[PDB]
Design a protein around this ligand. Structure first.
Ligand SMILES: [Zn+2]
Ligand SMILES: [Zn+2]
Lengths: 257, 301, 257, 301
């Protein structure tokens, strides 16, 4: 139960990366943080009520492998996980990607579930928060995946004309399809430290201009300077901060730290 | 010029050089060019879509619309040449036309990034859809792009946000929006102007969440095995229609749209007129609701 | 009556620069074109009905010279001239700057008169067109001049939520205050060939970066490539073109060339 | 540090070094610093406005507001450092704060173009006023800039359109907007965020359609003769109020806001509260109408 750190090596006791939310205490480097866990570390205590759980995929194209590549290593339906709940006594919907699930690839379920969060947060008339981590759209579902962008973004539109605050939290990594959809349409775009965010992966991007990619290129710190991000909040602070901001946008009283 | 497997049709073109009445052996030309196309494989189709002689945005603009004034710029950075847009009439009715402009020759292709736009192009594209709405005007877009230009400035300039902001704003558009994939429907860079009420797709055009070559070299560790991906994903016209994905499939001339752009214009110009009219029986309120509804349905959940 | 050309020298008969609208026939170079004349060359025949003529200035600050620098060389009240009328039988308001008047400087009257055009075009419920030529705001009226920007721009806002097309025609030159106000808030921004448009004059701009200013810098052709201009229309063609565009924005039948 | 003519006050600062009760000779310090300021000339005033120790946006942000989260970027190009903006509370009430941030030291001044913003700064400024409205929030701006950054990229990037688009959008804003010139109200680059319902101006701040030096060297073919221009145009606090131009003149501590920022905050923070409350008795409909009305009145025609 003694894990090693991605970029640092500093051995660490698992129980430690707990009150430190899957974060390196010696390098501050944020690491893989489960979709269901995140939602917990955000929403208050007990309040967690899962939404869109009655949603499961299916191969409608008979792709290569597909049905088999599509649940034992995540015990989850699809890359996204919506969850109703509260933040400091504030009613608020949430949703997060499981980058372990094929790459947090967006496709059918991911889009549907997301929409749910919006539908839920719409009638309840409360804020929506989404933690994003993906590598693109689920090719296995082709144009179905693509359309998700237009949909999730179309819904987010209702959310907005209603006056309800939606905060997108871009986490390392958030690329392609999601990056270029609801993951960037937040009222407040917040990126976790040193995250990798962009539309095209550095890979393809690179073998294009056939040269060296600028320093930092696509990292929270790079983006924030190109004005694509409102601010960069660290994970532990995230909980309260989100409540803090949201609280102001909602005119509600500031949370009790 | 002439594509690959169109060879025998190209060779048969040796008629102009030519009893004297035999000049109508081209009846066989009409066949062949008929049987050759009858059994085309998925991958073979995408090649016609990418065909070097295929009509681009401006071609239809000149073939089916009149009084076309092309508007430029996004008001903040530049005038993307990979995006053509402007106000014209469609049988008197003014319309806002927006589309990917590739370019016949290797020089124009360069001047217009082979129709791959930079974030500043979608920002222009939207500014125009917005001007349309402002003046209770219809919006007609022509999709044909390898995808959104992947680059440094593109990213540094918000290629993501640019695209996203369009998917959002387009759905809320308060006028009719007919979208036609006249060529290569590439990724969300094509989707950035494809959120319409009616979404037709020409007979040989394609559409995908990623190019075949890529998808190929990602889930087959092989570039050349792209054709395999093409048939896997379902990038072809019908393959899609069989899934409520596209509204209608506009047909091309015998052996491809390149074989006769004046007829293709006819077919298309017609189809637009159809949709762009069985849509005016709708109230703005209904229109948008219809759209939002059609939008949530995409997929199987 | 035989005038010489600004940048070309090609001698020309005055009567000639008539059906050629103050434009060089050998260099196509557009030249100084009177504010009252322009309005004529646009609006149809006879239809011309002047607005805001019952508006004259006054020095309320006792500036240096002022009252004296402020009408014999223009026979006009202030740099702007509003005029109601029609275009190809289409009801349409117009307005144009007299760069001869101190520099087409914007100040009090200029702003008031402009607003008129908007007020007029508002109840009539018809398109508004404005030809712009200025070198900034009338310093002689100080902050009064400045405020004009916020006002004219505030009115243009009504114009827009109403759905009425406003076309700003930027002509050489249009700088500072006006450039950075209603002169750039047009639904369609149209610049005459090789015009000089910008916020800061090249003068000041230059003595800043203390270097050489790029080629073309601030010319219709430069701007159009930075996307600040919709298109560049030549003067003679201007009349019909304006009608052509406007006609489409207004759903009316195309003018009869 | 210490300004020009404040010298004798600076020299009198030689008290800290110091019967033993004489320590209250500073009664004379309080005078002098009282009589010196009683007769200050127009030009002399602008110097205090530009005073090196004068409080900037962030100073009041920290002195009068709490829970201030600074938002960054315009979503398309960059995050202008000459513009500071973000969501904070004003006695519990969340507010959207936007202002010119110069910077004490010559290094910060560089990092923030001495508070002269680029078009990408107004685009950010507006994005925030827009987020305010979206969340039925008040907007409080602090004006203090030599003017809009004049440059190549600025122009190439739409410094004009950027400013204009703000003057338009700000007028239509559907919430209360209190604008205070805490320093140098320069040109339309300051006006780009000065279109408010209430427009207060601190006692020693200025405001003009062009800087004195310029106006000087243009209508006097002399740079140094700027002070002459300053008194000509009417760039001083009252000189303006005498023309329905500004709503109220917030007063500064004895001898300038720099002499005591904690008290200045008090005065200001108060004034805001005043306006930002005798404005909530208004309906959105009325509010905007009030504004539009106050907007058309500017001038004498
Ligand atoms: Zn570490
Ligand atoms: Zn000439």
């Amino acid at each position: 139960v003694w894990t090693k750190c991605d970029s640092c090596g500093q051995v660490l006791y698992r129980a430690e990366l707990e009150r430190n939310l899957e974060v390196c205490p010696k390098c501050d480097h944020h690491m893989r943080m489960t979709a269901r866990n995140r939602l917990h570390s955000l929403l208050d205590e007990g309040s967690l009520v899962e939404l869109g759980s009655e949603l499961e995929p299916k191969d409608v194209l008979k792709f290569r492998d597909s049905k088999k590549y599509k649940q034992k290593e995540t015990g989850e339906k699809d890359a996204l996980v919506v969850m109703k709940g509260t933040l400091y006594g504030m009613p608020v919907v949430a949703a997060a990607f499981e980058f372990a699930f094929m790459g947090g690839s967006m496709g059918s379920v991911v889009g549907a579930r997301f929409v749910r969060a919006v539908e839920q947060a719409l009638e309840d008339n409360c804020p929506l928060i989404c933690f994003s981590a993906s590598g693109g759209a689920r090719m296995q579902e082709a144009l179905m995946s693509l359309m998700q962008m237009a949909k999730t973004s179309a819904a987010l539109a209702k959310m907005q004309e209603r006056g309800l605050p939606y905060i997108s939290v871009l986490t390392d990594p958030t690329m392609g399809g999601v990056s270029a959809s609801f993951a960037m349409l937040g009222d407040l775009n917040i990126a976790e430290p040193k995250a990798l965010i962009g539309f095209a992966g550095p890979r393809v991007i690179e073998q294009t201009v056939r040269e060296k990619l600028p320093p930092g290129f696509q990292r929270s710190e790079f983006l924030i300077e190109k004005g694509a991000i409102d601010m960069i909040v660290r994970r532990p602070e995230m909980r309260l901060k989100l409540a803090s901001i949201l609280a102001k946008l909602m005119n509600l009283p500031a949370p009790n730290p | 010029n002439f594509l690959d497997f169109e060879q025998p049709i190209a060779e048969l073109e040796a008629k102009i050089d030519s009893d004297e009445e035999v000049h109508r052996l081209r009846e066989k030309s009409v066949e062949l060019t008929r049987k050759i196309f009858a059994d085309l494989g998925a991958w073979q189709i995408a090649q016609l879509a990418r065909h070097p002689q295929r009509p681009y945005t401006l071609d239809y603009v000149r073939l089916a619309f009149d009084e076309f004034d092309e508007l430029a710029g996004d008001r903040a950075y530049a005038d993307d040449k990979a995006i053509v847009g402007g106000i014209a009439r469609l049988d008197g009715r003014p319309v806002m036309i927006i589309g990917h402009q590739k370019g016949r020759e290797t020089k124009e292709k360069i001047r217009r990034n082979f129709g791959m736009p930079a974030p500043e192009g979608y920002r222009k594209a939207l500014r125009l859809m917005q001007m349309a709405e402002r003046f209770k005007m219809p919006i007609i877009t022509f999709i044909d792009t390898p995808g959104a230009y992947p680059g440094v400035g593109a990213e540094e300039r918000g290629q993501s946000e640019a695209i996203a902001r369009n998917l959002r704003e387009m759905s809320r558009l308060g006028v009719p929006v007919v979208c036609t994939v006249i060529g290569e429907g590439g990724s969300g860079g094509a989707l950035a102007i494809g959120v319409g009420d009616k979404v037709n797709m020409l007979q040989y055009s394609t559409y995908s969440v990623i190019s075949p070559e890529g998808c190929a070299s990602i889930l087959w560790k092989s570039a050349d095995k792209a054709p395999l991906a093409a048939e896997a994903m379902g990038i072809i016209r019908p393959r899609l229609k069989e899934l409520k994905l596209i509204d209608s499939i506009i047909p091309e001339p015998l052996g491809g749209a390149h074989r006769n752009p004046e007829a293709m214009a006819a077919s298309l110009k017609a189809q637009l007129l159809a949709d762009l009219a069985d849509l005016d029986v709708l109230s703005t309120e209904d229109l948008k609701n219809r759209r939002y509804q059609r939008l949530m349905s995409y997929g199987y959940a």
